[PDB]
Write a structure and sequence with these properties.
- The protein is built from 4 helices and 5 strands; from the N terminus they run E-H-E-H-E-H-E-E-H.
- It is an alpha/beta fold.
- Strands 1-3-2-4-5 form a 5-stranded mixed sheet.
- It has one domain.
- The longest helix has 11 residues.
Amino acid sequence: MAHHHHHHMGTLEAQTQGPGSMIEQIGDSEFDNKVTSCNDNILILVDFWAPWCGPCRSLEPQLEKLAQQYTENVKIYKINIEDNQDVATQYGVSAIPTILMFKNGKKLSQVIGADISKIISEINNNIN
């Protein structure tokens, strides 16, 4: 059963849809503005990039799977200022990519790597 192979070959984006669906893109000056000041108790998931997660390679991220169900309870945001945020250094993460979970101005959990079993565990912990 020992299956375990990631791919840090690079990144590949193909956001055919975004503003209005569930995965929105945000910038630096509005990052904290809508993420940290979020008092709606909704679960915000900010992610860096998509590791070849395109419809012509492997469009199968955990985010879609759960967001499709929990869309009204979750909001995924592309952190445009990915080139310069030591938040990853704060978490001390070394993986591609990484997703952080915010709610009520609080930090709940963070998706490191690609472990569906783990992401469902942490996400379902903080939402219904």
